[PDB]
Structure formats: C-alpha cells, structure tokens
Amino acid sequence: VTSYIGGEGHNLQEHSVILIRGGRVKDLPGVRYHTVRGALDCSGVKDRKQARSKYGVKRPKA
Amino acid sequence: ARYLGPKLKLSRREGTDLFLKSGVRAIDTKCKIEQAPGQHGARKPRLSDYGVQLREKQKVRRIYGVLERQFRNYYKEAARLKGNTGENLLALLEGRLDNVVYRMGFGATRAEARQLVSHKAIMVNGRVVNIASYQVSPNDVVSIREKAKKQSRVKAALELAEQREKPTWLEVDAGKMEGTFKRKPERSDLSADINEHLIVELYSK
Amino acid sequence: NIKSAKKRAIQSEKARKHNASRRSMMRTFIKKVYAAIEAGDKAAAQKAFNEMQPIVDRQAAKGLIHKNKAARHKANLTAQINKLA
Amino acid sequence: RFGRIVQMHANKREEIKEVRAGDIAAAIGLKDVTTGDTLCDPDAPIILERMEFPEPVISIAVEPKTKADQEKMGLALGRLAKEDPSFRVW
Amino acid sequence: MVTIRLARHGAKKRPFYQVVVADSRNARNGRFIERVGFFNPIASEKEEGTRLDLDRIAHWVGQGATISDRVAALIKEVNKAA
Amino acid sequence: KIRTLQGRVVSDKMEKSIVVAIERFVKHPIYGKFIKRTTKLHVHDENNECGIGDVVEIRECRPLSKTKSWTLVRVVEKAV
RNA sequence: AAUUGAAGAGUUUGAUCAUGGCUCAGAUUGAACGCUGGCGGCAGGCCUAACACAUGCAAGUCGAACGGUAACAGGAAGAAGCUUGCUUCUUUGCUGACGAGUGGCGGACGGGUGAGUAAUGUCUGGGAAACUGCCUGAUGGAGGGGGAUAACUACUGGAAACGGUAGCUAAUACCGCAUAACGUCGCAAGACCAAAGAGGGGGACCUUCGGGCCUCUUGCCAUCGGAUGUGCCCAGAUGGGAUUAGCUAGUAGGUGGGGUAACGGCUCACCUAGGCGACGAUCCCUAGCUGGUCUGAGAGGAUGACCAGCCACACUGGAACUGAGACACGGUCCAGACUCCUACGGGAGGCAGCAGUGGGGAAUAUUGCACAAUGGGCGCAAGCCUGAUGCAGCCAUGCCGCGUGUAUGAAGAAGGCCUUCGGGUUGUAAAGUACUUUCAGCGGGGAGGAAGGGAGUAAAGUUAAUACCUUUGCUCAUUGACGUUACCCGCAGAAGAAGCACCGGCUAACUCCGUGCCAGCAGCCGCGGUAAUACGGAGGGUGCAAGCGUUAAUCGGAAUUACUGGGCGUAAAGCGCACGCAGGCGGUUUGUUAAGUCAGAUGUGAAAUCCCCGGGCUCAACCUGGGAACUGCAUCUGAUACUGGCAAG
C-alpha cells in the first residue's frame, strides 16, 4: 500500500523498516495511511516544538 | 492535578468573583475583573449556547476545583439517587470536606482550606481525615486537631468568615473550632447565582 | 517422567498379567457352555453351567467383572438351555 | 540476585546449591555484571580487587545481506557486546 | 465426599470467606453445592462477622458431610447456645 | 397426569414404527407472528395398527431404537 | 423503596425544500504508539504461530500393612586410652525413627489452552433402561488353610537406562476351601459368591518366657438405601452462503445371538425398502458454548478477555490396559515428524503446568518468596508435599484517591508579546513577608490477618480396671511468607514532584511575524496565488490532567435494514403480463375441544455480575449483608372472548 509522510524533511530511502497508522489523506487519491514519525527508521521532524506529540519531536531541554 | 495556577484569572473569565482569593485584602481592587482574561479578552463574543452551558459548568467547577473526571462522577451519582438531579448534584457536592470546612469557616479560601485538610489537621467525628472529597455524612460533627491548633491561619479564618454572612445548616463553636453539621443542604440555602439545568443538560450528551 | 510413582506402570503390568489369564479362564468356560448349546446335549450343558457359576461369581467379588455382567451371564445361559430343553 | 549455580565441567551443567571460597562456579541470571566485577556481600563491609582493562587493535566493518536483518545486526552483535571486553562497536 | 469448607474472597491483605458446602474434589472458589453462612477475619467492630446457617450444616451432617477444620472451629467460636 | 402429546401420523411405510408430526404454534422471537412450526418424531408403537391421518396420543419412554424413543398410547379419529 | 428515562451539527445549490450517503460531538478497550511522567490502593497483563522449546521445580504419602535398616541418634555386654568408669571402639533392629522394595490409597483433582467442534457439544426444561473410591445410616458376619514372589542373597550382562540366571523370607499382596442371607439367576425347587488383620493399656489365669486372655481404637467383606459425582435419552434454542438440490446404504426399522455399568445398529447374521429434505437436508467457509461484558431510552446490535459452570484437546494420528472413575497433560504400546545422550550395541523426551527463551508481531511481565492462612492428596496424628493459593517484582494498560503549597503582595516591576503608540496585556502572576508541611527522604513505636496444634492437668464418659482412647473445659510456652508491613509518632524544609492537545465553521479559545498554490495542514467542508485568526514560529487564550492526544475496535447518533421505528408515479426501488401448487391470510351462526391465549399456583431460573436500602477499609475504587431481579422456561389447575382444529348450518 501507500502512505503519507507528514511534516517535512524525511530521511527515508529505498528500504526502511517503518511503522504505519491508518488515515485518509483525501487530497491524495488512493493513499490511505500515515507513517507515524517517532517510530523506527522514519525519524522525527526538526523545528516542530509545537504539536510535537504528533511528528514525535521531544521536549526541548530546560 | 489541583489547579496550581494564577488564581483570579478564572474569575475574570467568569466576570464575577467566586471568592477564590478572599484573604486579607477583602476588597477586589488590584484585579481589574470582568474585561481582561487575556490579550483579546477586552471584547465580547456572541457566546453560543454550548459556551453558556460550558461556562456555567466551569463556575461550579472552579469554586471547588473539581477536575472533570471527578466532576462527572457526581453527575453519575446525582442521577443515580432519588430526588432531582439538579438538586442532588449540588447536595452531594456540599458534603465535600473542604466545602464543609469553608461553610463552617475554618478556611477563608478553598486553597487555604484544603491545605489544612490535606495536611490531616482535622478530626471529623472522632477520626482524622486527610482526603478532602470525604462525604461529610448528615447529622454529624467535625473537630480540629488540638496538637496543631491555632497557628495564625485558623484565627484569620475565624475573623473574616464571621464577617461573611454566617451560614445556616451548621453551628460553629467559634471559640475553639468545634464544627457541627446537622441537616440536608436545601436548594434555597445556596449562593443562588448558579443555575442547575445548564449542567444536567450538558451531561445528557 | 522419572517420577517415583512410575512403579504404577509395572504394578499394572503384573496386574494385567493376573487379569487376562483369569479373564480368559471365565471366557473359556463360557465357550464350553456355548459349545454344548451348539451340541444340544442337556446334561453336558447343565453341568458346565453348574460348573462355571462359582467361577463367575467369584471374580465379581475380586471386581474384575461387574456384578450385573456376572448377573447377565447367568441369565444368558439358563435362557438358552430352557428354550432348548 | 543469584539464580542458579553451576560448576561448569567444560560447558556441562551440574547444579550447585552453595559455594565456598576458592572454588570456580557459574552464576546464572545476573543482568548487569561486567568483566572483572567485584561481587561482594551487601549489609556488610564492601571490598574491591579490580584494576585492568586491555586494549583494542584493528577496526573493520560490515553490512548484512539486506536491511531487514539490521535490527538483528545491532542485537546479535549487541548480544556479543555484553561478552567480550576488548570488542567494541561503532 | 461432600465437605463444608471455606472459600476465600476479597482483595489482597483484606480477606473474606463464605463457608460453603461443596464437593471436595472441586476448586476452592469454584463449583460448590450451597453457600451456608460467611466469616470475616478482619471483622471491624460491628456484631456481624459470622451468620452461620446452622440448621443445614446440621442437616448435611445426616447426609454424610465432613466439616472442615476452621468451619468446625467457628461453630466452637460461635456456640450452639447463641 | 403424565407428559403426552397429540401429533399426526405421517410415514407408515414401515413395521412397528411411526414418524409422527406435532404442531407447535410458537411465537416468533423478533417479529411477533405465530408460525406453524412442525416437529417430526420417530415413535415406537405396538404391532401395525393404524394408517395415515389420525391424531395419536404419544408419551416419552425408553430409547427403544436408535431414534424411536416414544410410545403410542392410542389412536383417535380414524378417517379415509 | 429495586430502570426519575431518548438533543444535535457540518456537507450537494446562486438560494430552497426533500431524498440520500459521508463525517464529527458520547461511551468503551486484555489495547498499541508519540510526547511527558510524583506516590498510594484494587485490578488486569501472549488477542498473533495448538510455533519449536534449554534449565530448575509443577504429586506424593503411608512404619497404625510388611520383611527389613543402607544412613542418623540411642539404652546397650563389652573396648582401650589410661585424667580406674573419663571414653576410642566392638556387639545388637532390642528402641525413636527410616532410604530400596513389596503392598494400600492418590496420581482421572487442582492447573492450562480454545486447534478442533455448526452439533456426538452448549444453554434451557424434562425423563428411564444404570453405575458411583472416599464420606454416611442400617442389618450381619469377621471360620479355616495354601503356593509363590519381590526385597535380599551367589554368579553375571551393560556406558548408562535396565537387567538376566540360580536360591530365599513377609505382607491389610494373591489363590482356593467352609459358610451363607432381605443377594444374582431361575415360573419353581434349588444352585452359586465374600472377608485381613493391625495400634494402645492392663487386673487376673495362663507365659512354650513371643503370646494367648480382656477392653478400647480402627480397618475389613456382604445386602438394601442416603449424599455427591458420572454415563445416557428426548423437546426447543444455538452462525454466514441456494453462485450448496437432492441426500444416505449399518444407512431407516423388525427378529434373534452376542455386546453394554445400563439403553440403542451399539456389533454382526437374516428379513422389510425404507429414513432425512424448502419450517433449508447434504455441502463449503467461519466459530468453542453459557452466566454475562460493552453500548442502547428500550427493543435490539457487537462480543464471549478476566472471574465461574460446561465441553474438547495434551507434539500428530490410532488402540488398549489399569482402576471407583481415563481410552488418561507431567502413564503404557505402535506408527510418523522433530530434538538429546552415547562407549555406536542401545536408550530418552514432549511447557496448550509456573517462570523463562528464540521466534511471529504494533502488542504484554520475575527462571522470585513461603507452605504462615484457605483448599486438596496420604496419614491415628504429628507432619510431608502442593508454580493450587496466598504474596512480592516489573509495566499509568485501566479505574479510583492524592500531591507539586497557602495567604499576602502594584513601583502595577523587569523581561517578552503587542500598541489606533497615548497605553494595554502577561499579572498578585513572580520577588519579598508570614505560616502549613500531607505523600516522598529519615529515625522510633505498632495492629490484625492466628483458628489451631504441642506437653501437662482436672472432669465426664469408658470398660471387670481409677489404664487406653474420646469429649470437655484449663494453664504454660508457642505458629507470620508478606514485612525496615497497615497504621501511628517525631525531625528537617516550600522543598524532592506538570505536562500533552487545540484555538476558520463543526467547537470552548486570538493577534503578530515568516511564507507566497511553495513549504505544508486536514475527521468533514475545505485553507495557502504577497495583509493566512486554518501553513510553520512566538506571545496570548481554552480544554483535560499524571496523564493527554493519534490509530485501531464496537454500539450509539443511524428512524442510513426501520420488530418497536422506512419506503417503491418523478429522488434507489412494481417482476412486461397472466395462470397456478407449497405456503400466508380468510365472511357469517351454533355447538364442542383448550392447541395458541390469559389468570393463579409449583419447581426451577447455580454463584457472581447489574440495580435499591445498608455495612467495613480515613474517602473512593474496592470487598461485602439481605432484598429485588434473572422480564425466561417447564409442569399442574382453571376462563372460553379472540385465533386455530373438529361437526352442522
């Protein structure tokens, strides 16, 4: 199947063990899933300090 | 999980005072109440029906700091019993320990009141209780621990609360803090600015 | 496994060796009776039936054969002979 | 803890229920123990006898037949990371 | 061999028992014939700690039941004159 | 008294036996309409007595055959 | 007293009303994942590969059945050091005990799993042709003898596992014989069948010095019943598909022999030519069932985890033994696959038992502690064993309780974010002031969960006996895994402890900057083309809270499967029309039956769960008392309108 790559700047490639969670990406025809960023070889996004429970960015240190 | 934030900001989001920061300055001067909950709280919304149900649900919540998970349990409890769910919701909520601590005047604010209760300095009916959500059962009594008595928080609570309206269904000893609670809390014996059908309508769905 | 109640295996083997012999002792006496019913001679059928009756009832006391089975084998024989003669 | 104790006659397992001083035995379990560890008796005086860590020398590399074994590659070599002192992973 | 034993109910460190007539082969809290009374070992000061159905326990005696250890002891603790 | 049915004789092409049909006007569980729910029983009887089309009192008994476990009491309403 | 209970919104169009799907607001979870993360209580924790499994444990006990004693400690005639009774040792099963074996009982219970199983099963309500260790009541006996055989011995085979050969001693082991009845068979007369002795104490007679004798305790075998459990039959209920129409040949029934604990084609012989099927047979796919859980106003829909009843399986397939009960998890035998030991000859085993491992997967734990309490096995009992169970560990997975402070405090601070540039907002929020100080950290006290059981003693039984044994009060010393427990008391100090999502409408909550159909957001409608409250970053604000969202999942909303409770002229939908069997429904009158129907009674509807009035842990979750309830089902006795059957008009 296909899946969407949320956020921006993904380090994905030809083979990567990733994790998949369902969800309609309506504007894209025939893509029904979302790669969950915070999982395996699909790493987290940079500069995503807000709404970081999705896209898997950790809390900045303080 | 208690509230632990800036205090009167909730009162400016509710316009009126819910007596949340009474204390020594018994007059709300440095508060600028009603028209400034935030950077854009200097205006007014059309304030939809869902909102006027929620904001009324927020007021009955914020006087006693009851979290939603704990708050919804009362609605499950009030509708379980007999009588009216509008009347039962506040009645079982009046039986909270810090509510009877406040109604007997042992605390001037509920945050000041619960600090006494959580630190187990109150011997209600013959047993010291540190959990504020304890139902103070009808026709009972409530005492204060003598070995932690009168450390300048109790006396200021004795001063101010005897200027404030002198509650009805209970008797304060006023000399050495021996509270007695007698009867069922009636709908007519209330603050009365709160509504009740706003809440039980919201909790149907 | 090597549990020390595995003697129940060899305690059953000497038990079955005791049984099957004495179980066949009963059955062979039934064969002698049944052969006489194919023969038809009455006194040979009666005496054999009068012979194995103490053998049949005795193993019921040892419990190798149920009482009603032992009661059935009495009722089997006497019914066959009476209809014959 | 101490799970099981074995005298270990060349990777053969015989059970030991009590160990004396001066004997060699294998303790089974022991999640976080390293090389040359000074296992002492707690609720008692604590001792120490360890001072040595040898050298690494030649570092080469590897890459498996596919990327589907890469999780086992870090695991099985990580399984080998616990064993040998002079054997590092980069 | 139907017996009259105890079945443990309640939470950890705060037990409770209901003395039940059951077939002795079966499990403790499992399949039983009839519950006859109960017992509380941490029975805080209210008079209700045991309400033993004495007449059926006396009836099951005639049916050949084997009254267990503490069950017999509770009858000796809650006497046949009170 | 004892448990005894009414039935109707159906298949009598055999010896010392009968398959009876007993009508059950049960209520449907969800739709509330009464359905003529049939029930057919291999029923034992004595020597070959009756024919098809006659109501027959029948009671439960020993499993006389593999399937036949009921006994015909009496034959009522002989017809053509 | 015990159901005081049902909402809607967005979205087609330029706009409207409908039909109509899609989506959200709610609850729930054996949940995973992302970010964060303080503590306590009760819970739950392999849903996928019934995939293969290393290691330790998961079932033993009995000396009050018996020959014996290999260990351990003994009185014990004695031995030798030689501190002449201080001790090294030799005797010896004569004591308390006790491996190895014979024998008795258990191991068929508990514990696990849901592959198979669509009906051999399960739930519900009934039945007749049975069996049932142990426990129990009653009625009696309990006479007399025998031959081997373990163990162990002498030889010997092997690496072990395990033997093999020749002698040998006991038994509550086994085998006759006597003698039988309310027993089995038989129309009858009659014929035939059982059993075992052990343990304590002792006046007196007798002591071949054992014992017999007496009493007491217990066991034993026969018959008829109880209780409990078990096997069996019958009616109904119990999934999807007709793109699954015929199906079956010991198959449907009889008769007779045999089999069966008992019934039967159960299993054969011979005969009859039938049996099941449109109320769905046969066939294919999927599935353990139920009490109930979840949701729903209810009716229903989904589901069957944990706890409890039942059933099936125990590496795969087949068979039987033993025994009260198994066609048997930790038994046997055989076939197959897969592993392990080896001296190469030959043997060994089954985690779907508790942990634990590799693996599969998004996804789930400790090779832990004690037999202290409850329960079970054996035993007179003491006790032994018990991965049942009670507890502890890890994991916010869930539910519930609690904290991270309270009050005061305005120059309305600084700083940040804005500013119609004057101010405003953050915000009494901080600082500072004075107090409180739970839980955590620390030091001392401290329940209950413990009833029993052990030795002694007095009393009543008890017997020829003040003995024994039994019961009863009574005293002493004791039994706590958890556990530096629950709880309590004091010390130091605000001090160790707050996040995650959203903010265009739905929906509670906005500005600025960057960015320009790009980067990206998104459950739906839809935003972004240089002034974006929807994109990302700040500030502000709202929601919830030790959790918060995302995804998956089920019902709800959905009256979008409409039984309650929908439609069909144009919105999806009258077969093109007609005849007609099954089947559905059926004018009117009387009589009769009571099937349906309704009323009352009875049995049952397991417990728990759910609901109400109560009780106990400080509250609560939670455990728990009675009741109600389980709306059902079956039977019995009535009523005769209505529906049906029958008879007549």
mmCIF file of N, CA and C (backbone and C1' of nucleotides) in Angstrom, chain G residues 418-440:
data_model
loop_
_atom_site.group_PDB
_atom_site.id
_atom_site.type_symbol
_atom_site.label_atom_id
_atom_site.label_comp_id
_atom_site.label_asym_id
_atom_site.label_seq_id
_atom_site.Cartn_x
_atom_site.Cartn_y
_atom_site.Cartn_z
ATOM 1 P P C G 418 4.993 40.467 18.380
ATOM 2 O "O5'" C G 418 4.383 41.789 19.030
ATOM 3 C "C5'" C G 418 3.587 42.720 18.270
ATOM 4 C "C4'" C G 418 2.280 42.978 18.988
ATOM 5 C "C3'" C G 418 1.651 44.337 18.734
ATOM 6 O "O3'" C G 418 0.893 44.374 17.527
ATOM 7 C "C1'" C G 418 1.741 43.946 21.059
ATOM 8 P P U G 419 0.895 45.674 16.539
ATOM 9 O "O5'" U G 419 0.421 46.890 17.459
ATOM 10 C "C5'" U G 419 -0.938 47.007 17.934
ATOM 11 C "C4'" U G 419 -1.035 48.104 18.969
ATOM 12 C "C3'" U G 419 -0.656 49.488 18.471
ATOM 13 O "O3'" U G 419 -1.789 50.134 17.904
ATOM 14 C "C1'" U G 419 0.387 49.052 20.573
ATOM 15 P P U G 420 -1.814 50.486 16.348
ATOM 16 O "O5'" U G 420 -1.857 52.077 16.346
ATOM 17 C "C5'" U G 420 -2.301 52.803 15.184
ATOM 18 C "C4'" U G 420 -3.499 53.657 15.523
ATOM 19 C "C3'" U G 420 -3.362 54.491 16.790
ATOM 20 O "O3'" U G 420 -2.819 55.776 16.511
ATOM 21 C "C1'" U G 420 -5.335 53.178 16.916
ATOM 22 P P C G 421 -1.466 56.237 17.225
ATOM 23 O "O5'" C G 421 -1.487 55.428 18.596
ATOM 24 C "C5'" C G 421 -1.421 56.113 19.858
ATOM 25 C "C4'" C G 421 -0.124 55.809 20.576
ATOM 26 C "C3'" C G 421 1.064 56.710 20.243
ATOM 27 O "O3'" C G 421 1.715 57.097 21.446
ATOM 28 C "C1'" C G 421 1.682 54.447 20.011
ATOM 29 P P G G 422 2.295 58.579 21.595
ATOM 30 O "O5'" G G 422 2.810 58.669 23.127
ATOM 31 C "C5'" G G 422 2.381 57.673 24.088
ATOM 32 C "C4'" G G 422 1.067 58.097 24.692
ATOM 33 C "C3'" G G 422 0.603 57.301 25.916
ATOM 34 O "O3'" G G 422 1.233 57.606 27.163
ATOM 35 C "C1'" G G 422 -1.193 57.534 24.412
ATOM 36 P P G G 423 1.326 56.468 28.318
ATOM 37 O "O5'" G G 423 -0.210 56.149 28.621
ATOM 38 C "C5'" G G 423 -0.605 54.955 29.335
ATOM 39 C "C4'" G G 423 -1.639 54.191 28.535
ATOM 40 C "C3'" G G 423 -1.905 52.763 28.995
ATOM 41 O "O3'" G G 423 -2.845 52.659 30.065
ATOM 42 C "C1'" G G 423 -1.477 52.757 26.678
ATOM 43 P P G G 424 -2.761 51.403 31.074
ATOM 44 O "O5'" G G 424 -3.004 50.126 30.145
ATOM 45 C "C5'" G G 424 -4.271 49.926 29.473
ATOM 46 C "C4'" G G 424 -4.214 48.723 28.546
ATOM 47 C "C3'" G G 424 -3.938 47.366 29.173
ATOM 48 O "O3'" G G 424 -5.106 46.790 29.755
ATOM 49 C "C1'" G G 424 -2.641 47.599 27.210
ATOM 50 P P U G 425 -4.955 45.659 30.893
ATOM 51 O "O5'" U G 425 -4.204 44.457 30.159
ATOM 52 C "C5'" U G 425 -4.861 43.664 29.147
ATOM 53 C "C4'" U G 425 -3.910 42.615 28.600
ATOM 54 C "C3'" U G 425 -3.267 41.705 29.635
ATOM 55 O "O3'" U G 425 -4.116 40.623 30.015
ATOM 56 C "C1'" U G 425 -1.593 42.519 28.184
ATOM 57 P P U G 426 -3.927 39.930 31.460
ATOM 58 O "O5'" U G 426 -2.518 39.190 31.348
ATOM 59 C "C5'" U G 426 -2.320 38.094 30.426
ATOM 60 C "C4'" U G 426 -0.873 37.643 30.442
ATOM 61 C "C3'" U G 426 -0.308 37.305 31.813
ATOM 62 O "O3'" U G 426 -0.616 35.972 32.213
ATOM 63 C "C1'" U G 426 1.196 38.739 30.683
ATOM 64 P P G G 427 -0.597 35.585 33.774
ATOM 65 O "O5'" G G 427 -1.531 36.690 34.446
ATOM 66 C "C5'" G G 427 -1.964 36.554 35.809
ATOM 67 C "C4'" G G 427 -1.880 37.886 36.519
ATOM 68 C "C3'" G G 427 -2.646 39.039 35.878
ATOM 69 O "O3'" G G 427 -3.135 39.914 36.897
ATOM 70 C "C1'" G G 427 -0.363 39.605 36.018
ATOM 71 P P U G 428 -4.484 39.550 37.703
ATOM 72 O "O5'" U G 428 -3.977 39.197 39.172
ATOM 73 C "C5'" U G 428 -2.741 39.731 39.685
ATOM 74 C "C4'" U G 428 -2.136 38.771 40.679
ATOM 75 C "C3'" U G 428 -2.962 38.551 41.948
ATOM 76 O "O3'" U G 428 -2.764 37.221 42.456
ATOM 77 C "C1'" U G 428 -0.852 39.399 42.531
ATOM 78 P P A G 429 -3.347 35.953 41.652
ATOM 79 O "O5'" A G 429 -2.270 35.716 40.501
ATOM 80 C "C5'" A G 429 -0.894 35.447 40.837
ATOM 81 C "C4'" A G 429 -0.136 34.967 39.626
ATOM 82 C "C3'" A G 429 1.323 34.646 39.904
ATOM 83 O "O3'" A G 429 1.463 33.324 40.422
ATOM 84 C "C1'" A G 429 1.189 36.050 38.012
ATOM 85 P P A G 430 2.398 33.064 41.709
ATOM 86 O "O5'" A G 430 3.842 33.505 41.191
ATOM 87 C "C5'" A G 430 4.888 33.870 42.108
ATOM 88 C "C4'" A G 430 6.112 34.318 41.344
ATOM 89 C "C3'" A G 430 7.241 34.866 42.200
ATOM 90 O "O3'" A G 430 8.046 33.817 42.731
ATOM 91 C "C1'" A G 430 6.843 36.337 40.391
ATOM 92 P P A G 431 8.411 33.804 44.298
ATOM 93 O "O5'" A G 431 9.334 35.088 44.483
ATOM 94 C "C5'" A G 431 10.596 35.207 43.792
ATOM 95 C "C4'" A G 431 11.149 36.603 43.953
ATOM 96 C "C3'" A G 431 11.337 37.069 45.393
ATOM 97 O "O3'" A G 431 12.591 36.627 45.924
ATOM 98 C "C1'" A G 431 10.208 38.748 44.161
ATOM 99 P P G G 432 12.636 35.828 47.325
ATOM 100 O "O5'" G G 432 12.147 36.894 48.410
ATOM 101 C "C5'" G G 432 12.956 38.043 48.746
ATOM 102 C "C4'" G G 432 12.089 39.137 49.338
ATOM 103 C "C3'" G G 432 11.331 38.760 50.604
ATOM 104 O "O3'" G G 432 12.121 38.913 51.781
ATOM 105 C "C1'" G G 432 9.835 39.759 49.070
ATOM 106 P P U G 433 11.802 38.020 53.081
ATOM 107 O "O5'" U G 433 10.303 38.409 53.466
ATOM 108 C "C5'" U G 433 10.011 39.635 54.175
ATOM 109 C "C4'" U G 433 8.621 39.583 54.776
ATOM 110 C "C3'" U G 433 8.305 38.349 55.610
ATOM 111 O "O3'" U G 433 8.806 38.447 56.938
ATOM 112 C "C1'" U G 433 6.528 38.747 54.102
ATOM 113 P P A G 434 9.262 37.118 57.721
ATOM 114 O "O5'" A G 434 7.884 36.430 58.129
ATOM 115 C "C5'" A G 434 6.994 37.078 59.064
ATOM 116 C "C4'" A G 434 5.647 36.389 59.084
ATOM 117 C "C3'" A G 434 5.672 34.893 59.356
ATOM 118 O "O3'" A G 434 5.767 34.617 60.759
ATOM 119 C "C1'" A G 434 4.285 35.324 57.493
ATOM 120 P P C G 435 6.054 33.117 61.267
ATOM 121 O "O5'" C G 435 4.614 32.434 61.216
ATOM 122 C "C5'" C G 435 4.464 31.005 61.136
ATOM 123 C "C4'" C G 435 3.184 30.660 60.418
ATOM 124 C "C3'" C G 435 3.033 29.189 60.063
ATOM 125 O "O3'" C G 435 2.531 28.436 61.156
ATOM 126 C "C1'" C G 435 2.604 30.487 58.148
ATOM 127 P P U G 436 3.083 26.949 61.415
ATOM 128 O "O5'" U G 436 2.328 26.071 60.323
ATOM 129 C "C5'" U G 436 0.906 25.853 60.407
ATOM 130 C "C4'" U G 436 0.428 25.069 59.208
ATOM 131 C "C3'" U G 436 1.136 23.745 58.961
ATOM 132 O "O3'" U G 436 0.567 22.698 59.744
ATOM 133 C "C1'" U G 436 1.047 24.970 56.946
ATOM 134 P P U G 437 1.518 21.588 60.420
ATOM 135 O "O5'" U G 437 2.214 20.851 59.188
ATOM 136 C "C5'" U G 437 1.431 20.313 58.106
ATOM 137 C "C4'" U G 437 2.306 20.056 56.899
ATOM 138 C "C3'" U G 437 3.423 19.045 57.091
ATOM 139 O "O3'" U G 437 2.873 17.741 56.891
ATOM 140 C "C1'" U G 437 4.142 20.900 55.768
ATOM 141 P P U G 438 3.610 16.441 57.487
ATOM 142 O "O5'" U G 438 2.773 15.236 56.852
ATOM 143 C "C5'" U G 438 1.382 15.036 57.194
ATOM 144 C "C4'" U G 438 0.548 14.789 55.948
ATOM 145 C "C3'" U G 438 1.009 13.677 55.021
ATOM 146 O "O3'" U G 438 0.609 12.400 55.511
ATOM 147 C "C1'" U G 438 0.276 15.551 53.751
ATOM 148 P P C G 439 1.694 11.222 55.667
ATOM 149 O "O5'" C G 439 2.171 10.920 54.177
ATOM 150 C "C5'" C G 439 1.389 10.086 53.296
ATOM 151 C "C4'" C G 439 1.956 10.119 51.890
ATOM 152 C "C3'" C G 439 3.439 9.808 51.760
ATOM 153 O "O3'" C G 439 3.720 8.411 51.799
ATOM 154 C "C1'" C G 439 2.937 11.726 50.480
ATOM 155 P P A G 440 5.095 7.900 52.464
ATOM 156 O "O5'" A G 440 6.229 8.465 51.496
ATOM 157 C "C5'" A G 440 6.293 8.057 50.113
ATOM 158 C "C4'" A G 440 7.340 8.859 49.365
ATOM 159 C "C3'" A G 440 8.756 8.818 49.916
ATOM 160 O "O3'" A G 440 9.468 7.641 49.539
ATOM 161 C "C1'" A G 440 8.196 11.049 49.377
#
